[PDB]
Amino acid sequence: DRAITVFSPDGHLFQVEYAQEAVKKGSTAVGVRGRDIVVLGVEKKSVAKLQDERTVRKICALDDNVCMAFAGLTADARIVINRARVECQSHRLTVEDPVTVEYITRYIASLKQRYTQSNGRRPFGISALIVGFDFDGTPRLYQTDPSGTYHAWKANAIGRGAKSVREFLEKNYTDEAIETDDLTIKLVIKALLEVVQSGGKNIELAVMRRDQSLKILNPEEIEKYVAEIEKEKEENE
Amino acid sequence: GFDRHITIFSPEGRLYQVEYAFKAINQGGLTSVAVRGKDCAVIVTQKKVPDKLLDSSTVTHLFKITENIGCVMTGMTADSRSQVQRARYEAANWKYKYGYEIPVDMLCKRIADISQVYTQNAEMRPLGCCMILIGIDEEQGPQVYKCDPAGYYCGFKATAAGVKQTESTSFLEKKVKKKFDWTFEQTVETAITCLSTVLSIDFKPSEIEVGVVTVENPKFRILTEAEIDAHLVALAE
């Protein structure tokens, strides 16, 4: 029938619906709050021997206090990153105070809504999630659906496996298990580690420790945290 | 589909829109003949006047484009008038941009380019009127040309256009193959007998309107009732 940016006879907006279902095609992405540190992981399992792993860029910085993660079309996501980065610098230029996570997420959501409006523009098939420490201490996490909206979550769980991983998070999203930075990291692991085999090094974590720069977790330390998670799994017969 | 509905190339490798537009010229029920001569160029078209409530003073199909170029239209009268207006604008604009008067071949080339633009693109449509314009050109003698709804501008010595154009062209081909130059009498008599043999009505000197451009007399003489009657009397003698 009709699959353009017009209202269907039953309501809805079918092109927007297709774009929202598109994110499935992509990768898992999880991330948590904790008042001490915001950590988010993507987990990628597909790097041939001839491609350079540097330029996968599944998680990127905006204003050295905000990081976003891809879920969906990589080209659309990268364009969104570039535009959001430019606007973040503009909001640094004016209003000299640094950008706020909610502000940049609102800008991304407004851009997506603008692109869903009118027939000319394809509705940006990328579901994003942005975390980071605000200027006033509190670290936050928003998830923006491709259509037009954003929502302040405690755990995001966006992409393939989203339903199962989100169920796992909401099952045991313990704040006492959040507590310390290492506890937060090990909670993000064994949660993202659940998705797919996650055996050797598929996990791709990312760390924002309060006012430090965006920390991309080193592979040996990632294996160390996996071993610690295995240790916690042990002694539980 | 829409190969035959819009101005796009056919899968067989043809352009059907202009092929149709040429038949629009035959539509409308009229014919016109143009004969270049040794020194003059005379054209003539029938004047189909249904009922006398019309003004035979203004029903004509021949016009002065400039002081030395005279045109005869064939086809839908609205498009014919539009193209006559365009040709007059082109002649005046040429005389303004360059000092000397516009050569007839150059004028026909510009009109053909306009028509070619029309057959290009898809928003507009070609104009269903084929124009035969004649004029004296120095160092060239009389000159006759034909611009068509496609953009192919050519045509010489003896050329005709309209419903029964093929028969007229055949007769004129016989006459030109008969190697003898036409003086400012034989040319007119040839055109008259050509059109009369095409539409045998013996041509009462009121149903055709002939235009003449000689070399010693420039300008587009729309020959009057008395002149056409004198030529008819001399021919039928």
């Binding site: - | 829109q17 009922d51 539009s82 449509r125």
Partner: protein, 238 residues
């Protein structure tokens, strides 16, 4: 047609514009009109169907004044007809502003006709659904009267008619002997012809809008004084 009669930019397989061929049908369906070039002027006339007595005195009159000396009697789709009349008024005003004096009727008809043809040439816009006579008089150029069809071109008319019954009107128009009859008797005869044409045989009562231009009005195309042409309507009735 079927496939080819959707946009005016699509030529027919035989080479015809079915959009205009259908726009002529609206003029053929709408109520008729008539205009006769009298000896020293032009007299218009048009029956207007009073679709309901709720309407006031004759409104949306098929006659219009496009310029001081020029009048337009239109038939067909009345809204687009009025817009076209506005185009004509603007054209006349522009010509008067540029070249001075008054716009010659032949050139005015030619310009409005080229404008109409512009509206049938393209695809996004549609052909005008109206046909109208432009009548004018001046001492220098006598009286002229040009009819423009929804897509065609102006043509000089001694007498013309358009609308529901063109042939029925034209028969008696050609029966009438113009070119030596004054605009007074012509104003009588045009009403006579309109009343000869069916008014209530299948329709409602009709109003007789009649227009003048000529040396008896020193140009200055104006509606004929209806109070004094009610007797002309009476003579038509007889």
């Amino acid at each position: 047609g079927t496939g080819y009669d959707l946009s005016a930019s699509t030529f027919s397989p035989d080479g015809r514009v079915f959009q205009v061929e259908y726009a002529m049908k609206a003029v053929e369906n709408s109520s008729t009109a008539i205009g006769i070039r009298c000896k020293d002027g032009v007299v218009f006339g048009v029956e207007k169907l009073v679709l309901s007595k709720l309407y006031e005195e004759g409104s949306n009159k098929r006659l219009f004044n496009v310029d001081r000396h020029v009048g337009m009697a239109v038939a067909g789709l009345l809204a687009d007809a009025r817009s076209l009349a506005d185009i004509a008024r603007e054209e006349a005003s522009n010509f008067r502003s540029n070249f001075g004096y008054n716009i010659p009727l032949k050139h005015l008809a030619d310009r409005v006709a080229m404008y109409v043809h512009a509206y049938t040439l393209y695809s996004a816009v549609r052909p005008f659904g109206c046909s109208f006579m432009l009548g004018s008089y001046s001492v220098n150029d006598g009286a002229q009267l040009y009819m423009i069809d929804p897509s065609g071109v102006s043509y000089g008319y001694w007498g013309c008619a358009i609308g529901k019954a063109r042939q029925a009107a034209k028969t008696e128009i050609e029966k009438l002997q113009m070119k030596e009859m004054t605009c007074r008797d012509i104003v009588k005869e045009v009403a006579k012809i309109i009343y000869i044409v069916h008014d209530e045989v299948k329709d409602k009562a009709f109003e007789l809008e009649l227009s003048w231009v000529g040396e008896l009005t020193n140009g200055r195309h104006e509606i004929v004084p209806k109070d004094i042409r009610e007797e002309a309507e009476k003579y038509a009735k007889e």
